[PDB]
């Protein structure tokens, strides 16, 4: 997360880290006790085995709940930035209580309106191109971008009904590498997104691009 501030405890207590190979590599969304969602690009094409999921610490590193993986069931239609979410099974089971929960999720057929406030969280680069990444977890306020103005600044191809955007438009304020598949909420502490991609991190007139789950719930409601 760049421009951001430090998560208080009890903040996204859905969320968690995702290490691979004992290193530093994703974030994720607790749906219940045995299922994380995450980018598809997080997962997509590697080894299972080198994940381990953390759950319930401001930390990447200790504290908290941890689980390996059971499965990976990424979206049907996933190809690169489109439809980028995927259905993480836990090999251990996750309770609720304390400073762990579970997401609510948004609405099949809903899409966040342009300028209203999401809050994105990870354990991410604090820097485009930093050289070490923060033990705790950040998180920083940006407004939804509306799609057509996201195609302007990207194509208008390259923006999918599957994808929505967030960011300032003289940049500063964004997810970036190590942030990608955890979340982003709405006003409402709605999981709306994951983090996907964008050119760059908080760049001027390049937003964050997520991954809609209103466009993704059927996906997400069957393997749930």
Known sequence: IVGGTSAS?????????????????CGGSLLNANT????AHCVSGYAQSGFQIR????????????????????????????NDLAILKLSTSIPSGGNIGYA?????????????????????????????????????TVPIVSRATCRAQYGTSAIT?????????????????GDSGGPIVDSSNT??????????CARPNYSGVYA???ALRSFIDTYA
């Open 9 to 25: 405890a009890g903040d996204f207590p859905f969320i968690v880290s995702i290490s691979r190979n004992g290193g530093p590599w």
């Open 161 to 177: 009904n599957q994808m929505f955007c967030a960011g300032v438009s003289s940049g500063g304020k964004d997810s970036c590498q």
């Open 55 to 82: 759950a319930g610490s401001l930390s990447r590193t200790s504290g908290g709940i941890t689980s390996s993986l059971s499965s990976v069931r990424v979206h049907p239609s996933y190809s690169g930035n489109n």
């Open 212 to 214: 809609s789950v209103g």
């Open 191 to 200: 999981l709306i997104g994951a983090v996907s991609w964008g050119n760059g």
């Open 104 to 140: 609510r999720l948004a609405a099949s057929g809903s899409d966040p309106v342009a300028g209203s406030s999401a809050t994105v969280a990870g354990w991410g680069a604090t820097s485009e191109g930093g050289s070490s990444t923060p033990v705790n977890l950040l998180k920083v």
């Open 36 to 39: 994380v969602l995450t980018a």
